[PDB]
Amino acid sequence: TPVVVDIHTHMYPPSYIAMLEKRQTIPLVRTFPQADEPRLILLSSELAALDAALADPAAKLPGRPLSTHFASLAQKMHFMDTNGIRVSVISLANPWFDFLAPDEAPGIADAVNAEFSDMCAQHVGRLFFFAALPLSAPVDAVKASIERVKNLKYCRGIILGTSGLGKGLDDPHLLPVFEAVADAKLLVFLAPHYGLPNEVYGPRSEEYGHVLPLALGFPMETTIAVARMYMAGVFDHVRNLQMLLAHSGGTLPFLAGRIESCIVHDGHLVKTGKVPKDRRTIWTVLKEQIYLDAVIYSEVGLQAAIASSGADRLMFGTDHPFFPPIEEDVQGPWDSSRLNAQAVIKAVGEGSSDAAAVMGLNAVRVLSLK
Amino acid sequence: TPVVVDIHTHMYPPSYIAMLEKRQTIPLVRTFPQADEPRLILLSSELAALDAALADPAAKLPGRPLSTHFASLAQKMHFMDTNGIRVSVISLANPWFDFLAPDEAPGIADAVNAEFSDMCAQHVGRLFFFAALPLSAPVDAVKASIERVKNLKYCRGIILGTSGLGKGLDDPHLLPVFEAVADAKLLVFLAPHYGLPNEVYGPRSEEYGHVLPLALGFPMETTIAVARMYMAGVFDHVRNLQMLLAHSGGTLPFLAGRIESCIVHDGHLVKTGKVPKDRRTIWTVLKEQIYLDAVIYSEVGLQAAIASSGADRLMFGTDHPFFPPIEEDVQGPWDSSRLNAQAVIKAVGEGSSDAAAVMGLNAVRVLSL
Numbered sequence: 001t002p003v004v005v006d007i008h009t010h011m012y013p014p015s016y017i018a019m020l021e022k023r024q025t026i027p028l029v030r031t032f033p034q035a036d037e038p039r040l041i042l043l044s045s046e047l048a049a050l051d052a053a054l055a056d057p058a059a060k061l062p063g064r065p066l067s068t069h070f071a072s073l074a075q076k077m078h079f080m081d082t083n084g085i086r087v088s089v090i091s092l093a094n095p096w097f098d099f100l101a102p103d104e105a106p107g108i109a110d111a112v113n114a115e116f117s118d119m120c121a122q123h124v125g126r127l128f129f130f131a132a133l134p135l136s137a138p139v140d141a142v143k144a145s146i147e148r149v150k151n152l153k154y155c156r157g158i159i160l161g162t163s164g165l166g167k168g169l170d171d172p173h174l175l176p177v178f179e180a181v182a183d184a185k186l187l188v189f190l191a192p193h194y195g196l197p198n199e200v201y202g203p204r205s206e207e208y209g210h211v212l213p214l215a216l217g218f219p220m221e222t223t224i225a226v227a228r229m230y231m232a233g234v235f236d237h238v239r240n241l242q243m244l245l246a247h248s249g250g251t252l253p254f255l256a257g258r259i260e261s262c263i264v265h266d267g268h269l270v271k272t273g274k275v276p277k278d279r280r281t282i283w284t285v286l287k288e289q290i291y292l293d294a295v296i297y298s299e300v301g302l303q304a305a306i307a308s309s310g311a312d313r314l315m316f317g318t319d320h321p322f323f324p325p326i327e328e329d330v331q332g333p334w335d336s337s338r339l340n341a342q343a344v345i346k347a348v349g350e351g352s353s354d355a356a357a358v359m360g361l362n363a364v365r366v367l368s369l370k
Numbered sequence: 371t372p373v374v375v376d377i378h379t380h381m382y383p384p385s386y387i388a389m390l391e392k393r394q395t396i397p398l399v400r401t402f403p404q405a406d407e408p409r410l411i412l413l414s415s416e417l418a419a420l421d422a423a424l425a426d427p428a429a430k431l432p433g434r435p436l437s438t439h440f441a442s443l444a445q446k447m448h449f450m451d452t453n454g455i456r457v458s459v460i461s462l463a464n465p466w467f468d469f470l471a472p473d474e475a476p477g478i479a480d481a482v483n484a485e486f487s488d489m490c491a492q493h494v495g496r497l498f499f500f501a502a503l504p505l506s507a508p509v510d511a512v513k514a515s516i517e518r519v520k521n522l523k524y525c526r527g528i529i530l531g532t533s534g535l536g537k538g539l540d541d542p543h544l545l546p547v548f549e550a551v552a553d554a555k556l557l558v559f560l561a562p563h564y565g566l567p568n569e570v571y572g573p574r575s576e577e578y579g580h581v582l583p584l585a586l587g588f589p590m591e592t593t594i595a596v597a598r599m600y601m602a603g604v605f606d607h608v609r610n611l612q613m614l615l616a617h618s619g620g621t622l623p624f625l626a627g628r629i630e631s632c633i634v635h636d637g638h639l640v641k642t643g644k645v646p647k648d649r650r651t652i653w654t655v656l657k658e659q660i661y662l663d664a665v666i667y668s669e670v671g672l673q674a675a676i677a678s679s680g681a682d683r684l685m686f687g688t689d690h691p692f693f694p695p696i697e698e699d700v701q702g703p704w705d706s707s708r709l710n711a712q713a714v715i716k717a718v719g720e721g722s723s724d725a726a727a728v729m730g731l732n733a734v735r736v737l738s739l
């Protein structure tokens with residue numbers, strides 16, 4: 001029954017953009033008279049560049065262009081139709097709701113999640129979504145939001161950043177949040193955004209474009225976050241919790257053996273009773289509570305992910321619209337999508353049952369996509 | 371049986387420890403009557419507890435103990451004999467010479483490298499070494515040290531930290547060093563130490579012991595350093611350069627596909643002609659100028675490493691003495707050694723030519739042992 005499903009695909013809905021347009025501090029959106037597309041500005045390191053362009057428009061247009069590829073539902077359906085994708089499970093892109101004031105957050109989250117549901121209702125059977133949460137609000141407001149989003153048509157989970165409530169995912173205050181999501185049977189899609197402190201990339205990083213933070217920072221951030229969750233015993237505390245990890249777990253399948261070795265050889269952990277004989281290894285968690293997307297661009301990475309979680313726990317994604325072709329027509333097929341489909345083919349064989357599972361059937365089963 | 375070679379194994383030699391004992395600032399070594407081992411003090415935070423133990427024989431011993439596992443050649447030979455290792459290619463452990471003053475550095479590097487050669491001479495055919503370089507000194511002094519160490523008996527390469535001269539491996543000033551080492555036919559062993567800024571691990575990190583900095587920090591640092599090297603075109607500028615990467619390239623075999631995709635989809639690089647059609651991909655460099663150690667603890671990671679560089683470019687290592695058994699006899703076989711040996715077996719099969727290659731024959735060929 002080989003239907004193709006994309007579980008890693010993003011949008012900024014109209015209500016989200018309008019919310020950002022009203023903002024007077026980062027992140028925010030400005031509409032310039034020169035260009036046709038609004039400007040999303042996130043990191044303060046480019047607010048200076050805005051002033052330049054707001055004065056000498058000869059200065060480059062700052063930040064990211066809010067293109068049709070981010071904002072347009074019709075564009076999303078076009079991408080799907082021209083890349084052989086039947087179903088998309090869309091999610092709000094970074095920075096989600098993390099920056100909002102505690103009082104305004106639940107209301108804004110409500111309207112945005114409402115719009116995602118309505119967007120999905122436009123193309124019944126082809127669109128589902130992960131909801132984002134007002135994580136800057138009190139935990140009680142977060143729990144009320146979870147009970148709300150689970151009753152929205154076409155909602156199939158939660159997209160979660162690595163900062164959690166502000167102290168990362170090993171924050172003890174997040175445990176009732178994880179419990180609430182797990183009990184509601186919502187899959188948690190963990191996604192990176194904050195990367196690594198730019199200092200790690202050295203004085204020449206600018207010369208390499210965005211290669212270092214995107215290729216290294218994001219997947220390393222994911223690895224660190226899940227490792228922290230694991231070490232804190234989150235997976236043992238909430239046994240029904242299920243995680244989908246962005247970019248094949250970042251680097252987790254490659255480092256899992258090293259993680260295990262470091263645990264069992266850690267003097268502090270062993271001597272304080274933190275390494276009991278019956279402990280659930282990261283390998284066990286990878287097979288029982290973790291799903292991995294297949295956004296890894298090579299059969300090498302993909303094979304490691306499959307060995308770690310199993311072919312029934314890998315899910316095809318594209319990370320649309322983050323990697324458009326630079327020279328080829330953006331309205332034509334995207335090689336950033338094709339690269340991952342090719343990786344799947346090279347790893348498990350075209351037309352195989354494993355291929356059908358990874359390309360969509362795992363997502364249909366796990367997320368009840370009807 | 372075919373020779374087992376350990377290419378990833380560390381020591382602090384007597385001359386290195388003696389030098390550290392004379393130091394007044396971090397890093398330094400102090401000995402105590404109430405302790406049978408010298409103390410390695412490496413952090414500014416530890417200086418506080420030092421004066422306490424320096425005052426009271428009652429207070430706690432600061433820093434980490436300099437055990438025989440780090441310091442004794444007999445202990446190294448015992449480890450090899452009880453873990454089935456015929457040949458070790460030993461190297462100075464972090465922090466090497468990175469902290470030394472520019473003028474004092476070349477002299478200290480000379481004495482330490484000389485002692486390494488002499489140690490190897492005590493067990494002919496079983497010991498070779500990677501030399502460490504005085505990288506805090508002017509490049510001319512570094513090149514001089516390079517020409518010195520290549521004529522030392524049993525020297526088979528160079529150990530290099532990720533900081534280089536102090537600005538990472540994509541520092542233009544480091545290009546003459548890479549050229550000098552490559553021209554001298556010395557393999558460069560790249561090893562981590564600086565990890566990642568501790569803040570990335572969050573406020574609970576100490577509860578997890580050293581798991582996060584060791585399991586994540588070290589290999590991620592290696593990945594970042596080599597990625598920077600590659601993006602700067604170092605491998606293209608020095609075509610005869612050969613580098614051995616610690617911990618199976620850190621995470622490189624897993625992220626190589628993502629790196630390539632990010633390069634070809636980078637607007638700034640493509641539109642400035644830095645992505646020409648004839649560019650050597652990271653996959654090509656992984657097969658031509660990179661060797662990977664097999665210190666990866668799982669056949670999952672090892673298979674990814676083998677797929678990336680080939681079975682003829684993987685080399686067994688133990689990272690001795692960094693992961694001793696915590697409960698089991700430290701004088702018996704090390705779990706941290708056998709995990710990697712088992713990983714080789716489960717990946718390529720026991721008794722296979724690939725197993726013999728990874729376990730030592732690659733190192734014999736590449737390092738002329």
Ligand SMILES: [Zn+2]
Pocket residue numbers: 008009010191246319322
């Ligand atoms: Zn994404």
Ligand SMILES: [Zn+2]
Pocket residue numbers: 378379380561616689
């Ligand atoms: Zn090491």
